[PDB]
DNA sequence: GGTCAGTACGTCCTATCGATCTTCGGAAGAGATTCAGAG
RNA sequence: UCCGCGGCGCG
DNA sequence: CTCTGAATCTCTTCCGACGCGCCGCGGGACGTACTGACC
């Protein structure tokens, strides 16, 4: 959706945006695994375990 | 229309004010409220100032242009335009005289110094609290004597009417009118001749200057007391209608109303024969009201309106940042302008910018209207406006037609230097954001985080051609400050080229042999080969021959695929070595500079565009990204921290044992933590910079890492070593708000998390830096404005002045380090003398040759150590500089053209980098070479060593090539083991002196006796407690007996038979003298050898403030003392911390005398010989002393060296031409020693150009010229001392400049740039220069 | 079209004199009705003047010579008109 | 604000100096579309004549 | 924001300031210094005289641009006349010589 | 003489200084006061 | 339409 | 021991980056009676 320049991070030393960018990806990934599990109409047990 | 040659300023006579006026204002009313019409005789009166509406009478009897010029009989309002209300002034006839506050309070008081009366007494007389005497007969009273009311009554009773005494402005005016200017001038000149006191001489000469100015100007002193008060035209003080029936009023209206009320009340009281007290009070109130109207707040509390804010007076209208000069005349709001947020246009060519279509339509509206009416689409202007408002398609086609080759000016604030405004051809774009070319951003200092830029439209043909030829971005590829390229690749552009030009040990397609760059591109785009694959490529390159024709050579070169693909875009003429390397920012900038020097402007522009395109494309293809894994932490970091903690624990235990002090403990802990930080940084960089790859043979090999952060930092695209350290190593020790370093550093990095404590510690530095930037901006701006104001007059006005004078340029070397090579300091300057091949008499470089790159290379080849170049400070041009003295135009490479405003360029070049400046016993030879000693006198001791008997001795190292690259200062009495001209090895160390000890040396061997060495009176002899040995100590004047003041302990040398020893080569006996607190280890009659030393005597701010102090020529706190004349030294008699020193010239009949506070460590001894400029006592050197003792070249060298030291420490590159320009502007004033046959007066301050021209014409007529000294004025004082009063008034201190110009009756000839900017005519620089020359022709013909 | 004025600068020798000469020629082409000496190529009078300067067809001396020729022709036309008026009167 | 998919890479100079390149999908989904309300007033006043 | 011509201030007779007032951009003293560093005398004159304060100048420039003549007829800025009147209102006779 | 327009005076409103917002740093110049040297 | 003051924000 | 000049101290005045945007608040005006000039 958005392309950001890598060059700002080193000079600016705002590394927190990189870590967030990582964690957000993980935050999305879990959701994706839920979303597919909801699209497949899987049992509540597997959803609860995940 | 009515072209004027000058602007004259003088005092206004009452008759002059009446001549200006169109009527008397005698009512304190503005408008009737029943009818919104001005009052009959008020401040807005129609029959005094003009009609309210154009060509319409006030009563409406006449309402058309046919009645033009008719004065109505019913109401007396002339039928004319309303614009006359903007011009016509009025007047108020004051019932009592009132003193002008400017001529009373603006120091120095013009009335006070004209009458030789103290300011407080004149204030007391004016404000009706004391009397003054005007005329006296046989009475005891004296003229100008002040009398209290009781004293006045006593005098009246004693003498009746034989004496005249009055109060107030009437009395002051009577005193002023009753003064004979010529007689007073003659009497004051006689007194000045008779007087001996220097303070009396200064007062007398300033009073004589004031009186002579009054005589010459034609102004009368009594005009300083106002009898008629001018009234400003109503349109300049408008009565603006508001919502709700209220009227917004200017404060001037309130001030005038107060003055009119007081005046009318005083007149009524005078008519009714009111008592003396009431009329005196009313006169005082009228005086206060007029003072408030003229300059509110200068005396007493400023009168305030209902908002409790002081009312704005006329002085406030002229003065200040918000005054007319700076807000309305030197700068303006302009039509045909817009602004918007800027974005990147990466598709743009260098000469074009993306302009929004709506902005273009609005800005070019009149052009569109004209082109619509030309094509018959719109019959009238209203139809054209309706068409454009509807935004029809034909309107868009017309707009595309009108902007085709019409440049627009883009400007970003602050405009620190001239690159802040540049011209571009506009390409119309959709959207509301201006698109800016990436390469111009560095010159603009523009990023795309929210910047807004302003757009201006050149209207006239001359404006369009100036935009195209002078201001367009294609002409601005070199920085005028230093000559280096300013349109330089950055960010992604640099990273992409760096990624393109890097090699990998084993890569796809390694070892292939390519037909050319095209095959490399084919292999890369097909995926068959990597960019970093090492391959042999056939390359054809071109080189210019001696005739300038490109000769081609083809060869197979080891290269990478990316380097060949990049070579595809390189212009013909450049070597392949310019691309056969990993290209960082410096390499690309150097490549562009080489292209400009070899091939010119157009190939360089094309090359820059292609470089930008290629860098962007290959940075995109690289997919360079920053991830958390790229911040690699050393594995050694934890153990380094543990070792450092162990060391600090050991030091803590040692301190608890009491073995070390608290300060020593603090220093030791800081040192060990700094060492740990260095180790962590070294480990981080070592791990980052290298990676291991498997080569073609299957073996591990090290190569430069492709880590993203390392690639960004190494390429120079972004980042640095310190920032990488903070990311991947410990970010180090932090300073408290007071500047002291915290004992425990921030051990964590930014990839790791800082603790709460560490973050709180870092915030101190963060906020300190932010606030420092906030203040630094203001300081730098003030400095830049001062520099511009001092240098704005200077323009190149002739080709060659014919001066053989110049300055000597040598490489700047400090402490064995060559801080600046000669090539940088001499490139682009014109040789003042012919340079000879070293060691021969053959001419290597002829005189008057501009030293371009080839000449500098030739100078380097022959190893020339010093050159003599022409300087701006040495130019003989009057009212300008010649093109040869200035030298190369740094922005264009060639010699500077006539008409270039070099002063503004210099000021901008110095001021722009201001915000980057900070605001808040052993000598070891480093290189193999030979040793040379200068300003040295030497003796040999019994040990065979060398002792130096000179205090200005310099030690230099010379290489076999003939160059010198070391410099040191050798203290007096230092011992050296090497002779002059000897050879020394690398690392050899020779130095022997004590900084805490001042030695005393003897010439020849003999026996030493004592004279005037008597216990108690002068000395004390004792067996010391420290060692138990005999010792002699010399007492100070505050410690010895009073009777021994004239007895000075001395040492005398005798031979083996007791005969007095004479100094070799002289008849002077060998005698030595000991100062106070000196200690002599020897006894009476002990033997010494030749060159024997026996003496035991006891012994910061930089940055932008340093530059400001250097340019303001501020004296140091404890300036060094310099010998004023060459001669022999002698001492005198001291008293309470002061000493007298006498220098007897070798032949001069007048010995100089000086007084020295004895707390200064006097360097020279009583028997030494000195030369003018020699350091008598060490310390900071006052620039004024340097100018008056060593000369102009010395002071300019000192200022240039110091300013360049500051800038070079910060890393800024500014050519010395600009500092020399500022220095020349500082040396513009001279003082006269002997008038000779000229009309000047001794001690007067004149322009150096004027005295130079007068001496030239006198010598042409054979008369004796006037002798002069030169004065070093600071930039502020130099700006305020200009002959143009308009420029000085526009700069600062408007009241003082205006008052002095009014009393002096000055005439401004409008020679400078600022004056013509105020007037609104073409500046005498650039395209306008020729125009002014035509003026100079016509006034010559007339 | 034009991007750099370096060639015209070399022809004239000074950027300021170049601007003055080009402005004079462009004003001749725009208001004075003079025809260009080079193909227009949709360029404006500013760029056409610069291109004429580049080819060496226009400089200060050439413009002065052309203006002197035009003034002489105008004086000749005035003399011819006076002669015709005299012939009509005679 | 909004959660946005972000790639850290240079892209043809459209991220040159802090600049941001945005997908058209962001605009189509109205993710940063905002509503602004302006108050405009017309005032009738007593005037002379 | 963009402006070609609009309202002018009462006293300074110069373009208004601000987008809300449809004003023009301020060509401050640093911009004047930038133009003086170049040889841009004609551009500087047209910004000082015609585009800001000269009333007759700006009217004639607008008419000439509509007529297709990009020529300037500069006059005296009105702010200088205001300055002269303000100095004369202080009792100082300031005048232009050899008009 | 009578009428209209213009001009003049009053009201809002005082009465203690007390309301009132109030307090930088650096450099230069002018004036006043003090110390040292000479008589 | 002008001026002033206060507050806030961006480059 | 006193006087004058020079030096030092105290007090006052001037200067302090540019450009742009938004909001709020404030800012003498109105009424009545009397006098003079014109018809
Ligand atoms: Mg920015
Ligand atoms: Zn009338
Ligand atoms: Zn010269």
mmCIF file of C-alpha atoms in Angstrom, chain B residues 181 334 388 564 951 1209:
data_model
loop_
_atom_site.group_PDB
_atom_site.id
_atom_site.type_symbol
_atom_site.label_atom_id
_atom_site.label_comp_id
_atom_site.label_asym_id
_atom_site.label_seq_id
_atom_site.Cartn_x
_atom_site.Cartn_y
_atom_site.Cartn_z
ATOM 1 C CA UNK B 181 28.746 80.298 14.788
ATOM 2 C CA UNK B 334 4.354 41.004 -5.012
ATOM 3 C CA UNK B 388 -11.324 31.757 -17.882
ATOM 4 C CA UNK B 564 29.910 -0.993 -18.105
ATOM 5 C CA UNK B 951 61.475 34.719 21.233
ATOM 6 C CA UNK B 1209 36.929 22.893 12.117
#
